[PDB]
Amino acid sequence: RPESELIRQSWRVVSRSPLEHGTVLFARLFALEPSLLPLFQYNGRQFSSPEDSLSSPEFLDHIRKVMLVIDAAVTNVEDLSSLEEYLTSLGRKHRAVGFRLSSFSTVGESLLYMLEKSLGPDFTPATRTAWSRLYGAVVQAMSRGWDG
Numbered sequence: 001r002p003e004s005e006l007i008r009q010s011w012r013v014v015s016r017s018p019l020e021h022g023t024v025l026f027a028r029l030f031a032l033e034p035s036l037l038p039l040f041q042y043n044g045r046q047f048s049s050p051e052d053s054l055s056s057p058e059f060l061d062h063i064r065k066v067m068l069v070i071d072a073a074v075t076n077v078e079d080l081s082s083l084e085e086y087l088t089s090l091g092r093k094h095r096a097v098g099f100r101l102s103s104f105s106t107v108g109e110s111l112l113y114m115l116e117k118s119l120g121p122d123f124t125p126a127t128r129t130a131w132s133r134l135y136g137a138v139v140q141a142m143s144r145g146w147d148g
């Protein structure tokens, strides 16, 4: 597939500094959907402001975890059915923390933003299309965690 290669080459740029790029993803996410902020409940406390999230070591570890799952998806881009069972359970876990299926699109848009900003002119509409498909495949697996 030409899509597989576009994903791998774009990801190489990003995976060089995953927390820096992840931080972009999340900042953007909270700008688009501020109601996602309270779902992170480290020590039974809620962040007041998005910028609070950025000083929390647990929150930053969660960004690293995110980036690691996407990296797994990229590595398995040629066959993502091998991650299906993990992603389903990852879905279920997020369902339990109070994540809602409709917020997947915001996360998607946030991912695309981060890619668009990191790659600049290298973010071609075919790159965009490829990542949307990848992301969509991930969401479809995770969504099975809402079983139905």
Ligand code: HEM
Binding pocket: 029, 036, 039, 040, 041, 058, 061, 062, 065, 066, 069, 070, 090, 093, 094, 097, 099, 107
């Ligand atoms: C964007 C909205 C999301 C929110 C609000 C959110 C929230 C959470 C929370 C509250 C936890 C539990 C505490 C912790 O481990 O830090 C968690 C765990 C996790 N999240 Fe997320 N998360 C989101 C998105 C994602 C996405 C898109 C992925 C992966 C692509 C991801 C991967 C993980 C992983 C790997 C864990 C650890 C799960 C476990 O094995 O226990 N998260 N997330």
